[PDB]
Amino acid sequence: MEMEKEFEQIDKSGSWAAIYQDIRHEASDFPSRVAKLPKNKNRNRYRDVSPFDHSRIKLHQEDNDYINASLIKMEEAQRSYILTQGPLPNTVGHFWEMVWEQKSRGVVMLNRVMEKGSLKCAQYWPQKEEKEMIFEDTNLKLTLISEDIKSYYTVRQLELENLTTQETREILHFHYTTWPDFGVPESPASFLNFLFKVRESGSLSPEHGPVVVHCSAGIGRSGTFCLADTCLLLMDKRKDPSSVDIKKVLLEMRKFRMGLIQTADQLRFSYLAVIEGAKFIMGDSSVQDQWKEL
Ligand SMILES: O=C(O)c1cccc(NC(=O)c2ccno2)c1
Numbered sequence: 001m002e003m004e005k006e007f008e009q010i011d012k013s014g015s016w017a018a019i020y021q022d023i024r025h026e027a028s029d030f031p032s033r034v035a036k037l038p039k040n041k042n043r044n045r046y047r048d049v050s051p052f053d054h055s056r057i058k059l060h061q062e063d064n065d066y067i068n069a070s071l072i073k074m075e076e077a078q079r080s081y082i083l084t085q086g087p088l089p090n091t092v093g094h095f096w097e098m099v100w101e102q103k104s105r106g107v108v109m110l111n112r113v114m115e116k117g118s119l120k121c122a123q124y125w126p127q128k129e130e131k132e133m134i135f136e137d138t139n140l141k142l143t144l145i146s147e148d149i150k151s152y153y154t155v156r157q158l159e160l161e162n163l164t165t166q167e168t169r170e171i172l173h174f175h176y177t178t179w180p181d182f183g184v185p186e187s188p189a190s191f192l193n194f195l196f197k198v199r200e201s202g203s204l205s206p207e208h209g210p211v212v213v214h215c216s217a218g219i220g221r222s223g224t225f226c227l228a229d230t231c232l233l234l235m236d237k238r239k240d241p242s243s244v245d246i247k248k249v250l251l252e253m254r255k256f257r258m259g260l261i262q263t264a265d266q267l268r269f270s271y272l273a274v275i276e277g278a279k280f281i282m283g284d285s286s287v288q289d290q291w292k293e294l
Protein backbone atom coordinates (compact mmCIF):
# COMPACT_ATOMS: atom_id res chain seq x y z
CA MET A 1 0.00 0.00 0.00
CA GLU A 2 0.99 3.66 -0.25
CA MET A 3 2.24 5.31 2.94
CA GLU A 4 -0.17 8.15 3.80
CA LYS A 5 -3.28 6.00 3.40
CA GLU A 6 -1.80 2.93 5.02
CA PHE A 7 -1.17 5.43 7.83
CA GLU A 8 -4.81 6.55 8.14
CA GLN A 9 -5.89 2.92 7.95
CA ILE A 10 -3.69 1.93 10.91
CA ASP A 11 -4.84 4.96 12.91
CA LYS A 12 -8.54 4.28 12.32
CA SER A 13 -8.08 0.58 13.11
CA GLY A 14 -5.77 1.24 16.10
CA SER A 15 -3.35 -1.53 15.10
CA TRP A 16 0.09 0.12 15.53
CA ALA A 17 1.09 -2.38 18.23
CA ALA A 18 0.25 -5.32 15.96
CA ILE A 19 2.16 -3.85 13.01
CA TYR A 20 5.18 -3.20 15.23
CA GLN A 21 5.13 -6.72 16.72
CA ASP A 22 5.13 -8.20 13.20
CA ILE A 23 8.34 -6.28 12.49
CA ARG A 24 9.87 -7.60 15.71
CA HIS A 25 8.93 -11.17 14.74
CA GLU A 26 10.40 -10.93 11.22
CA ALA A 27 13.63 -9.12 12.22
CA SER A 28 17.01 -10.74 11.60
CA ASP A 29 18.89 -12.59 14.35
CA PHE A 30 22.65 -12.75 13.93
CA PRO A 31 25.39 -13.63 16.44
CA SER A 32 26.98 -10.99 18.70
CA ARG A 33 29.72 -13.12 20.29
CA VAL A 34 32.44 -10.47 20.58
CA ALA A 35 30.06 -8.14 22.47
CA LYS A 36 29.38 -10.81 25.09
CA LEU A 37 32.98 -11.70 25.95
CA PRO A 38 33.69 -11.03 29.65
CA LYS A 39 36.47 -8.55 28.90
CA ASN A 40 33.93 -6.27 27.17
CA LYS A 41 31.29 -6.05 29.93
CA ASN A 42 32.21 -2.48 30.87
CA ARG A 43 32.14 -1.46 27.18
CA ASN A 44 28.37 -2.05 26.92
CA ARG A 45 25.77 0.28 28.40
CA TYR A 46 22.87 -2.22 28.20
CA ARG A 47 23.18 -6.01 28.35
CA ASP A 48 20.41 -6.58 25.77
CA VAL A 49 21.72 -4.10 23.13
CA SER A 50 24.73 -5.46 21.23
CA PRO A 51 26.22 -5.08 17.74
CA PHE A 52 26.13 -8.10 15.44
CA ASP A 53 29.57 -9.57 14.70
CA HIS A 54 29.20 -9.23 10.92
CA SER A 55 28.54 -5.46 10.94
CA ARG A 56 30.43 -4.23 14.04
CA ILE A 57 32.97 -1.40 13.78
CA LYS A 58 36.46 -2.58 14.71
CA LEU A 59 38.91 -0.24 16.45
CA HIS A 60 42.41 -0.31 14.87
CA GLN A 61 44.09 -1.70 17.95
CA GLU A 62 45.53 -5.14 18.63
CA ASP A 63 44.72 -5.38 22.36
CA ASN A 64 40.94 -4.97 22.19
CA ASP A 65 39.19 -3.86 19.02
CA TYR A 66 35.67 -3.75 20.49
CA ILE A 67 33.19 -0.85 20.54
CA ASN A 68 29.40 -1.09 20.72
CA ALA A 69 28.83 0.38 17.22
CA SER A 70 27.39 -0.95 13.92
CA LEU A 71 27.77 -0.03 10.21
CA ILE A 72 24.35 0.28 8.51
CA LYS A 73 25.13 0.18 4.72
CA MET A 74 22.09 1.00 2.50
CA GLU A 75 22.91 -0.21 -1.00
CA GLU A 76 20.11 1.24 -3.17
CA ALA A 77 20.04 4.60 -1.36
CA GLN A 78 23.86 4.83 -1.44
CA ARG A 79 24.01 5.98 2.21
CA SER A 80 25.92 4.55 5.16
CA TYR A 81 25.56 5.29 8.89
CA ILE A 82 27.37 4.23 12.07
CA LEU A 83 24.89 3.74 14.92
CA THR A 84 26.40 3.61 18.41
CA GLN A 85 25.48 3.84 22.10
CA GLY A 86 26.08 6.99 24.13
CA PRO A 87 29.71 6.84 25.23
CA LEU A 88 30.51 5.55 28.75
CA PRO A 89 33.11 7.01 31.13
CA ASN A 90 35.49 4.21 30.05
CA THR A 91 34.73 4.43 26.28
CA VAL A 92 35.01 8.16 25.44
CA GLY A 93 38.53 7.63 24.10
CA HIS A 94 37.34 4.67 21.96
CA PHE A 95 34.48 6.81 20.59
CA TRP A 96 36.76 9.53 19.24
CA GLU A 97 39.22 6.89 17.97
CA MET A 98 36.38 5.45 15.85
CA VAL A 99 35.44 8.91 14.54
CA TRP A 100 39.08 9.43 13.49
CA GLU A 101 39.66 5.98 11.96
CA GLN A 102 36.35 5.90 10.04
CA LYS A 103 36.94 9.47 8.60
CA SER A 104 33.55 10.77 9.79
CA ARG A 105 32.76 14.47 9.38
CA GLY A 106 29.67 14.68 11.61
CA VAL A 107 28.31 13.34 14.92
CA VAL A 108 24.53 13.32 15.48
CA MET A 109 23.39 13.30 19.15
CA LEU A 110 19.68 12.79 19.86
CA ASN A 111 19.63 12.72 23.70
CA ARG A 112 20.55 14.98 26.63
CA VAL A 113 23.35 13.96 28.99
CA MET A 114 20.77 13.69 31.78
CA GLU A 115 17.17 12.60 31.18
CA LYS A 116 14.54 11.36 33.64
CA GLY A 117 16.99 12.24 36.42
CA SER A 118 19.68 9.76 35.29
CA LEU A 119 22.85 9.91 33.18
CA LYS A 120 22.21 8.72 29.61
CA CYS A 121 25.79 9.29 28.35
CA ALA A 122 29.13 10.76 29.36
CA GLN A 123 30.03 14.44 28.85
CA TYR A 124 32.28 13.49 25.95
CA TRP A 125 33.00 16.91 24.32
CA PRO A 126 34.37 20.16 25.84
CA GLN A 127 31.98 22.88 26.95
CA LYS A 128 34.45 25.81 26.89
CA GLU A 129 36.93 26.86 24.18
CA GLU A 130 39.81 27.26 26.70
CA LYS A 131 39.26 23.84 28.42
CA GLU A 132 40.19 21.23 25.81
CA MET A 133 40.05 17.45 26.39
CA ILE A 134 42.87 14.92 26.13
CA PHE A 135 42.13 11.20 25.78
CA GLU A 136 45.33 9.53 26.94
CA ASP A 137 44.35 5.94 26.19
CA THR A 138 43.89 6.69 22.43
CA ASN A 139 46.22 9.75 22.10
CA LEU A 140 43.69 12.31 20.82
CA LYS A 141 42.99 15.96 21.66
CA LEU A 142 39.58 17.58 21.25
CA THR A 143 38.87 21.36 21.28
CA LEU A 144 35.64 23.32 21.09
CA ILE A 145 35.95 25.87 18.25
CA SER A 146 32.45 27.44 18.22
CA GLU A 147 28.90 26.75 19.33
CA ASP A 148 25.54 27.88 17.88
CA ILE A 149 22.55 27.37 20.20
CA LYS A 150 19.10 27.43 18.58
CA SER A 151 15.68 26.69 20.00
CA TYR A 152 15.49 22.98 19.08
CA TYR A 153 19.14 22.05 18.54
CA THR A 154 22.77 23.16 18.94
CA VAL A 155 25.59 22.87 16.33
CA ARG A 156 29.20 22.80 17.48
CA GLN A 157 32.45 22.96 15.55
CA LEU A 158 35.17 20.77 17.11
CA GLU A 159 38.84 20.17 16.26
CA LEU A 160 40.14 16.61 16.66
CA GLU A 161 43.92 16.16 16.67
CA ASN A 162 45.75 12.85 16.40
CA LEU A 163 48.60 13.53 18.84
CA THR A 164 50.74 10.76 17.32
CA THR A 165 50.89 12.39 13.85
CA GLN A 166 49.86 16.00 14.64
CA GLU A 167 47.18 15.78 11.94
CA THR A 168 43.98 17.74 12.66
CA ARG A 169 40.38 17.57 11.39
CA GLU A 170 37.19 19.56 11.79
CA ILE A 171 34.19 17.60 13.19
CA LEU A 172 30.61 18.93 13.25
CA HIS A 173 28.46 18.05 16.32
CA PHE A 174 24.67 18.20 15.67
CA HIS A 175 22.78 18.02 18.96
CA TYR A 176 19.01 17.64 18.98
CA THR A 177 18.14 18.91 22.44
CA THR A 178 14.31 18.82 22.59
CA TRP A 179 13.19 15.19 22.19
CA PRO A 180 10.81 14.73 25.16
CA ASP A 181 11.76 12.56 28.16
CA PHE A 182 8.68 10.37 27.50
CA GLY A 183 7.08 9.53 24.14
CA VAL A 184 7.82 11.20 20.78
CA PRO A 185 7.40 14.77 19.46
CA GLU A 186 3.87 15.88 18.61
CA SER A 187 4.96 17.31 15.23
CA PRO A 188 7.89 16.12 13.07
CA ALA A 189 8.58 19.64 11.83
CA SER A 190 11.59 20.37 14.10
CA PHE A 191 13.08 16.89 13.63
CA LEU A 192 12.91 17.30 9.82
CA ASN A 193 14.39 20.80 10.02
CA PHE A 194 17.22 19.25 12.07
CA LEU A 195 17.71 16.42 9.51
CA PHE A 196 17.97 18.97 6.68
CA LYS A 197 20.62 20.92 8.61
CA VAL A 198 22.72 17.77 8.96
CA ARG A 199 22.31 17.11 5.22
CA GLU A 200 23.25 20.68 4.25
CA SER A 201 26.55 20.39 6.17
CA GLY A 202 28.02 17.60 3.96
CA SER A 203 28.14 15.16 6.91
CA LEU A 204 25.97 12.55 5.12
CA SER A 205 27.72 12.72 1.75
CA PRO A 206 29.99 10.15 0.02
CA GLU A 207 33.13 12.32 0.14
CA HIS A 208 33.31 11.61 3.88
CA GLY A 209 33.18 8.53 6.07
CA PRO A 210 29.81 7.53 7.56
CA VAL A 211 28.06 9.90 9.98
CA VAL A 212 28.16 8.68 13.61
CA VAL A 213 24.64 8.76 15.18
CA HIS A 214 23.78 8.01 18.82
CA CYS A 215 21.18 8.34 21.56
CA SER A 216 21.40 6.39 24.80
CA ALA A 217 21.24 2.81 23.42
CA GLY A 218 21.73 3.75 19.75
CA ILE A 219 18.59 1.97 18.42
CA GLY A 220 15.46 4.04 19.13
CA ARG A 221 15.76 7.76 18.26
CA SER A 222 18.86 6.82 16.27
CA GLY A 223 16.83 4.38 14.19
CA THR A 224 14.18 7.01 13.57
CA PHE A 225 16.80 9.42 12.15
CA CYS A 226 18.38 7.04 9.62
CA LEU A 227 15.04 5.46 8.61
CA ALA A 228 13.52 8.83 7.76
CA ASP A 229 16.64 9.99 5.90
CA THR A 230 16.89 6.81 3.78
CA CYS A 231 13.18 6.67 2.90
CA LEU A 232 13.18 10.30 1.70
CA LEU A 233 16.31 9.72 -0.39
CA LEU A 234 14.71 6.67 -2.07
CA MET A 235 11.56 8.71 -2.86
CA ASP A 236 13.78 11.21 -4.71
CA LYS A 237 15.75 8.54 -6.59
CA ARG A 238 12.94 6.26 -7.89
CA LYS A 239 10.51 6.74 -10.79
CA ASP A 240 7.59 5.78 -8.54
CA PRO A 241 7.94 7.33 -5.03
CA SER A 242 4.81 5.55 -3.77
CA SER A 243 6.76 2.30 -4.11
CA VAL A 244 8.86 3.13 -1.02
CA ASP A 245 7.83 0.69 1.74
CA ILE A 246 8.91 2.00 5.15
CA LYS A 247 8.46 -1.40 6.87
CA LYS A 248 10.70 -3.11 4.29
CA VAL A 249 13.39 -0.44 4.67
CA LEU A 250 13.29 -0.87 8.45
CA LEU A 251 13.68 -4.64 8.16
CA GLU A 252 16.68 -4.08 5.82
CA MET A 253 18.31 -1.76 8.37
CA ARG A 254 17.69 -4.32 11.12
CA LYS A 255 19.95 -6.75 9.23
CA PHE A 256 22.80 -4.51 10.47
CA ARG A 257 21.80 -3.59 14.06
CA MET A 258 19.17 -5.07 16.36
CA GLY A 259 16.16 -3.29 17.81
CA LEU A 260 15.94 -0.22 15.54
CA ILE A 261 12.72 1.65 16.43
CA GLN A 262 11.92 0.73 20.05
CA THR A 263 8.17 1.40 20.31
CA ALA A 264 5.03 1.49 18.18
CA ASP A 265 4.93 5.26 18.86
CA GLN A 266 8.40 5.64 17.33
CA LEU A 267 7.17 3.65 14.30
CA ARG A 268 4.14 5.92 13.84
CA PHE A 269 6.34 9.00 14.25
CA SER A 270 8.69 7.68 11.54
CA TYR A 271 5.73 7.41 9.15
CA LEU A 272 4.62 10.95 10.02
CA ALA A 273 8.09 12.36 9.40
CA VAL A 274 8.49 10.70 6.00
CA ILE A 275 4.98 11.75 4.93
CA GLU A 276 5.44 15.41 5.87
CA GLY A 277 8.96 15.50 4.53
CA ALA A 278 7.95 14.23 1.13
CA LYS A 279 5.72 17.31 0.71
CA PHE A 280 8.43 19.79 1.59
CA ILE A 281 10.96 18.20 -0.75
CA MET A 282 8.87 19.25 -3.74
CA GLY A 283 8.93 19.64 -5.37
CA ASP A 284 7.66 21.88 -2.52
CA SER A 285 10.81 23.77 -1.56
CA SER A 286 8.61 26.36 0.23
CA VAL A 287 7.85 23.38 2.56
CA GLN A 288 11.33 23.98 4.12
CA ASP A 289 10.76 27.60 5.26
CA GLN A 290 7.56 26.28 6.82
CA TRP A 291 9.33 23.57 9.14
CA LYS A 292 11.59 26.37 10.45
CA GLU A 293 8.56 28.51 11.34
CA LEU A 294 6.51 25.89 13.09
O1 LIG B 1 14.03 -4.80 21.98
C1 LIG B 1 14.86 -5.48 22.61
O2 LIG B 1 15.09 -6.65 22.46
C2 LIG B 1 15.71 -4.82 23.66
C3 LIG B 1 16.54 -5.60 24.46
C4 LIG B 1 17.33 -5.01 25.41
C5 LIG B 1 17.31 -3.62 25.61
C6 LIG B 1 16.44 -2.85 24.88
N1 LIG B 1 16.47 -1.40 25.00
C7 LIG B 1 16.75 -0.53 26.03
O3 LIG B 1 16.99 -0.88 27.18
C8 LIG B 1 16.87 1.01 25.71
C9 LIG B 1 17.01 1.58 24.47
C10 LIG B 1 17.14 2.98 24.70
N2 LIG B 1 17.10 3.17 25.95
O4 LIG B 1 16.97 1.98 26.53
C11 LIG B 1 15.66 -3.52 23.89
Ligand SMILES: O=C(O)c1cccc(NC(=O)c2ccno2)c1
Nearest residue numbers: 103104105169170171207208209
Ligand atom coordinates in the same frame (compact mmCIF):
# COMPACT_ATOMS: atom_id res chain seq x y z
O1 LIG C 1 40.88 11.60 1.49
C1 LIG C 1 39.69 11.96 1.50
O2 LIG C 1 38.98 12.24 0.51
C2 LIG C 1 39.02 12.08 2.87
C3 LIG C 1 38.32 10.98 3.36
C4 LIG C 1 37.70 11.05 4.60
C5 LIG C 1 37.77 12.22 5.37
C6 LIG C 1 38.47 13.33 4.88
N1 LIG C 1 38.54 14.54 5.67
C7 LIG C 1 37.50 15.10 6.40
O3 LIG C 1 36.37 14.62 6.45
C8 LIG C 1 37.69 16.36 7.19
C9 LIG C 1 37.26 17.65 6.93
C10 LIG C 1 37.75 18.42 8.05
N2 LIG C 1 38.42 17.60 8.88
O4 LIG C 1 38.39 16.36 8.37
C11 LIG C 1 39.09 13.25 3.63
